């Protein structure tokens, strides 16, 4: 029922590493400060996404046991989860409580950032489905680690080794749900169900990026490796 000593250590250790991220307010303060052109926004996106990949590799390297995995599998995990982690992190920031009308403005700014309307609806549909879950910081942190340690990723050779690493995180997450919402004995499964919608963002991420309303689509060397663009 309650969190054991080993689980309390895992959680706090996950929280510490998750906390090495660019503070949310910085990203939203900037978007809300003024309106930018589709060109300025594509550049804000590439800079933010390059820093996020770098932070994700450091977060991933700290996940208990990740280092012991076969090197090629380590690559397949990072590569397979980077786009999802980025959208889950964007979902987290989108649903953070803001002063009155600020979230309306944040949504308006993003909707008009340069992304094609084709991709706007699926994106806000996912961020909205996330906001309905009223996730805590510990939940976003655990869900991110669960996403990274997905044993059914493509080109994963040794799936069992990854299952062994993902299971303790699912266990801690499940215990937390059975506590933070005893009122919703579905919360754990609801959180897990969202991972299916997250996966849909892999399919058209490249299309979504190349469709941005700019005349040139310049990425960084790191983003080219991880996104399959250029």
């Amino acid at each position: 029922m309650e969190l054991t000593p080993d689980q309390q250590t895992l959680l706090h250790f996950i929280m510490d590493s998750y906390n090495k991220q660019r503070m949310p307010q910085e990203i939203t303060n900037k978007i809300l400060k003024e309106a930018f052109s589709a060109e300025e926004n594509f550049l804000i996106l590439t800079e933010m996404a390059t820093n996020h990949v770098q932070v994700l590799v450091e977060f991933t390297k700290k996940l208990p046991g990740f280092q012991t995995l076969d090197h090629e599998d380590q690559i397949a995990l990072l590569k397979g989860s980077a786009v999802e982690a980025m959208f889950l992190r964007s979902a987290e920031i989108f649903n953070k409580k803001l002063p009155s009308g600020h979230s309306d403005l944040l949504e308006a700014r993003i909707r008009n950032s340069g992304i094609s309307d084709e991709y706007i609806t699926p994106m806000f549909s996912f961020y909205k489905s996330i906001g309905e879950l009223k996730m805590t910081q510990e939940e976003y942190a655990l869900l991110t680690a669960i996403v990274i340690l997905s044993p059914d990723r493509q080109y994963i050779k040794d799936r069992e080794a990854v299952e062994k690493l993902q299971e303790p995180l699912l266990d801690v997450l499940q215990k937390l749900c059975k506590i933070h919402q005893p009122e919703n004995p579905q919360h754990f499964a609801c959180l897990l169900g969202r991972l299916t919608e997250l996966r849909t963002f892999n399919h058209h991420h490249a299309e979504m990026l190349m469709s941005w309303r700019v005349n040139d689509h310049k990425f960084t060397p790191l983003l080219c490796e991880i996104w399959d663009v250029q």
Binding site: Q54, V57, H71, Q74, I75, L78, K79, P221, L222, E225
Partner: peptide, 11 residues
Amino acid sequence: DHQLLRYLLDK
């Protein structure tokens, strides 16, 4: 190739 990613992972 994932040269950059392999680099960041090993360092």
